């Protein structure tokens, strides 16, 4: 028997957006993150909360300390900035798509920093609000981030979907198409 | 372009084999660059680049701090693992396979990522292209195994006996 | 539902 595993405590603070994140992952899937503003623990799968708790307030303090380190860092490079990195976007089903069978469509945004993006689901060229899921910025082995968007869908020959992904490195919103 | 500022830190608990061999690795990135590491196999902070030298100097001169990080292999890593060992480590999600006309094998909705896929009588050791392993993001994997000749078997930690076609 | 442990972030400066 061998149990090779990796747990990660991933946290960041981003300026000037003033956004922060604190999450855990196991082998590359998120176990939970902390809603900074609400100060609570959001478990990635519902079933998890029955095996484990976490004290959110600790994450908040961590973020605040990160924020203060950032200020220390800026001053050490002399406010010297860096170039943006553009998202690779990809769209795909969660299972084999079957006409008249409920399914989930996945927008996979990859290899991008900073960890801020505008992302919109388009059904037949028009913005979608219902049945959309968002996933905090997830860690990678490197210094880049990845993210998953999920929209519920019903397979149809008529419908045609797009993922519109806006990022600072891109010259303009890259959209990605998906028809049955 | 638009100027930004990131303080990014990852605290990685590496288990080579459950609690038998545990490595703590704390990594500091400023912007797009990793500047500082603490590696429990080393016991100290090491700058990755000039931008991290002052943190390593500040921190390695705090002896009780180095003493605390070393113990974190036990106080955090080992501790957290004994909990995750109840539900995450033994998580078993059985795969569903579907074959459609190159020949298409569909393996989906499974966890963990460890999977064996192969294809009359003898599996073709040639002419195979795959999507690799695909991470859904909701704690399930899916992958496509294709044969280009004008039955597939699947082995996986959730199944005592292989699944065929 | 055991509590999970974490690292406190360190002070730079």
């Amino acid at each position, epitope marked *: 028997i061998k149990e090779e595993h990796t747990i990660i405590q991933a946290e960041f603070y981003l300026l000037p957006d003033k956004r922060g994140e604190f999450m855990f992952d196991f082998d590359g899937d998120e176990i939970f993150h902390v809603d900074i503003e609400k100060s609570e623990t959001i478990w990635r799968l519902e079933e998890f909360a029955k095996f484990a708790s*976490f*004290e*959110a*307030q*600790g994450a908040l*303090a961590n973020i*605040a*300390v990160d924020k*203060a380190n950032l200020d220390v860092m800026k001053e050490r490079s002399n406010n010297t900035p860096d170039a943006n990195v553009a998202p690779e976007v990809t769209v795909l089903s969660r299972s084999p798509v079957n006409l008249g069978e409920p399914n989930i469509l996945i927008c996979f945004i990859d290899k991008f920093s900073p960890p801020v993006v505008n992302v919109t689901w388009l059904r037949n060229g028009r913005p979608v609000t219902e049945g959309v899921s968002e996933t905090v910025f997830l860690p990678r082995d490197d210094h880049l981030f990845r993210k998953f968007h999920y929209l519920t869908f019903l397979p149809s020959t008529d419908d045609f979907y797009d993922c519109e992904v806006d990022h600072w490195g891109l010259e303009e919103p890259l959209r990605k198409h998906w028809e049955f | 372009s638009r100027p930004w500022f990131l303080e990014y830190c990852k605290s990685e608990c590496h288990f080579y084999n459950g609690t038998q061999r545990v490595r703590l690795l704390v990594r500091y990135f400023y912007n797009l660059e990793e500047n500082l590491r603490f590696d429990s196999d080393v016991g100290e902070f090491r700058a990755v680049t000039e931008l991290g030298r002052p943190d390593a100097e500040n*921190w390695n001169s*705090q002896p*009780e*701090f180095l*003493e*605390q990080k*070393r*113990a*974190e292999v*036990d*106080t*955090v890593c*080992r*501790h957290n693992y004994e909990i995750f060992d109840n539900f995450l480590v033994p998580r078993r999600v059985e795969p569903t396979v579907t074959v459609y006309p190159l020949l298409v094998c569909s393996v989906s909705d499974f966890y963990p990522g460890n999977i064996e896929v192969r294809w009359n009588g003898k599996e073709e050791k040639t002419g195979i292209v795959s999507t690799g392993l695909v991470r859904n993001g909701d704690w399930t994997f899916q992958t496509l195994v294709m044969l280009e000749t004008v039955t597939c078997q699947v082995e996986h930690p959730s199944l005592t006996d292989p699944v065929t076609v | 539902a055991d*509590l*999970i*442990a*974490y*690292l*406190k*972030q*360190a*002070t730079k*400066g």
Partner: T-cell receptor
Amino acid sequence: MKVIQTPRYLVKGQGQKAKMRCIPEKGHPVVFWYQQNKNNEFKFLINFQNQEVLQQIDMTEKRFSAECPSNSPCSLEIQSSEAGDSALYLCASSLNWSQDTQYFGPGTRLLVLE
Amino acid sequence: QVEQSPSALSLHEGTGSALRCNFTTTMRAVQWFQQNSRGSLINLFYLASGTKENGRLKSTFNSKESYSTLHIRDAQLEDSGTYFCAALRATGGNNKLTFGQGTVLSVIP
């Protein structure tokens, strides 16, 4: 340099403000306040890193006011003293948020009379 | 939660004994303090593992077995006072030390 706390003792009547002064060791960003009672029980009140408050309990946000302005001494002040506030108030400084070692001031013994 | 014993101890000059702190969860490290007659807390020890020796005192901490001990040897009058251990649990959201119940140590002249 040891931690400094004044005043050593402090008597006040219900309704008054009680104000305590602490000077952390030179070069310690993190600062804590506790109450200790006569049965030797300790209660944590508030957390600071540098000028900024990180953590504090419900009571303190409601009845207390505290500051650690840069290069000046730290202070804690009860807004409207009650008899239940009688306690030894203790200040401690650490060098680093991520590391537990704490050094304590001599305290302020506060007594609140009617 | 931190159970500390014994509650009280009287020691003849030049004799010794030990204090103990058992933790109900994983602690990050442990500290021991003496509160003297003026009520000032003196740092006796910080440790995150192993055993440390300082003068007439020695201390062991074990995170996994979850206890800490404090040894006082060859007691002197100046040792009288109230002794505390103090730990932060690695799961605790608030960065604050939790204290043992304390041992009141009396050295008999």
